[PDB]
């Protein structure tokens, strides 16, 4: 309102100089003459290239169940993302960690 | 743990007044009763959705079938057949046995009487609406009018 004489502590002068972009920091005079299209295709191509007597049994023979850990393979199943915060993998890991 | 019919009528009136989710407010009325006891008494006996009828053939067949499938799990069995756990347990036992304003106006009148008594014997930075227009906005003029 500029008639008051109350000065806030965060209204003190600070960062009085504006930093401008330098020559290597994408100044607009070098932005204006560039072609972003072609550079975007070799960046995409580089990303795609860098993307790629008595005889006994066996000792474990006298059990009831076998090969129960057969289809147990996570692999890419940890890479799944679900947008449900109760059925996310992170929330399931959180609930099995923090509740005993 | 006994339940008189007077307490049942008071509980029914309290449920019809205070809804469902309030129980401590209900249990404030009932002497020597808890909110958990009131909730159990409502959901066990006094709820109007409890089927207080006789079992059909289909209900008894489903009850015997589900008692054969899941043994002694009546809290799971009972919402499938629509009865409560106690009724279906008792009926299953029976089937096995068979098989075997004015105050402010008065204060204003007293203040007016005191004001007339003081007149017969600041403004607190307010706006007096009876003296002039409070925020005078004149109507817009155009193409007409000769006042009055």
């Amino acid at each position: 309102s500029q008639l008051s004489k109350q000065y806030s502590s965060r209204d003190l002068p600070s960062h009085t100089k504006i930093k401008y972009r330098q020559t290597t920091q994408d100044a607009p005079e070098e932005v204006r003459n560039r072609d972003f299209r072609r550079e975007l295709e070799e960046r995409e191509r580089a990303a795609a290239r860098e993307k790629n007597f008595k005889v006994k049994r066996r000792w474990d023979d006298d059990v009831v169940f076998k090969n129960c850990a057969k289809g147990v393979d996570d692999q890419k199943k940890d890479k799944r993302f679900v947008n449900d915060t109760l059925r996310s993998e992170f929330h399931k890991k959180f609930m099995e960690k923090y509740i005993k | 743990g006994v339940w008189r019919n007077t307490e049942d009528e008071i509980l029914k009136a309290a449920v019809m007044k205070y809804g469902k989710n309030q129980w401590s407010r209900i249990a404030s009325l009932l002497h020597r009763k808890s909110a958990k006891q009131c909730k159990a008494r409502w959901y066990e006996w006094l709820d109007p959705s409890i089927k207080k009828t006789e079992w059909s053939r289909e209900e008894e067949e489903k009850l015997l079938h589900l008692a054969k499938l899941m043994p002694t799990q009546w809290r799971t069995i009972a919402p499938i057949i629509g009865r409560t756990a106690a009724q279906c347990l008792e009926h299953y036992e029976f089937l096995l046995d068979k098989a075997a304003k004015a105050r402010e106006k008065q204060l204003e009148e007293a203040r007016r009487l005191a004001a007339l008594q003081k007149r017969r014997e600041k403004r607190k930075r307010g706006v007096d609406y009876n003296a002039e227009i409070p925020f005078e906005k004149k109507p817009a003029l155009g193409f007409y009018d000769t006042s009055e």
Partner: protein, 84 residues
């Protein structure tokens, strides 16, 4: 001490009421609830005595408590007898 986590209390309170004051407040609230349910049900048989007692005029029966009249709903046979 944790002043913002102490149990809540205000100055000039007066304390909690005794058993008699809570009992008569519960009795007054039970009377209010019974009168509210009577006015909701619109039963004309309810009357208050000059000594202050509940009376069923259709049954002609006095009641000591509010729940005694609340359980008086026999009353259908007495209403059919007093209808004629």
């Amino acid at each position: 001490m944790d002043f913002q986590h102490r149990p809540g209390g205000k100055t000039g309170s007066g304390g909690v009421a005794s058993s008699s004051e809570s009992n008569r407040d519960r009795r007054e609230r039970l009377r209010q609830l019974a009168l509210e349910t009577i006015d909701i049900n619109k039963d004309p048989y309810f009357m208050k005595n000059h000594l202050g007692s509940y009376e069923c005029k259709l049954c002609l029966t006095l009641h000591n408590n509010e729940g005694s009249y609340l359980a008086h709903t026999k009353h259908q046979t007495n209403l059919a007898r007093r209808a004629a």
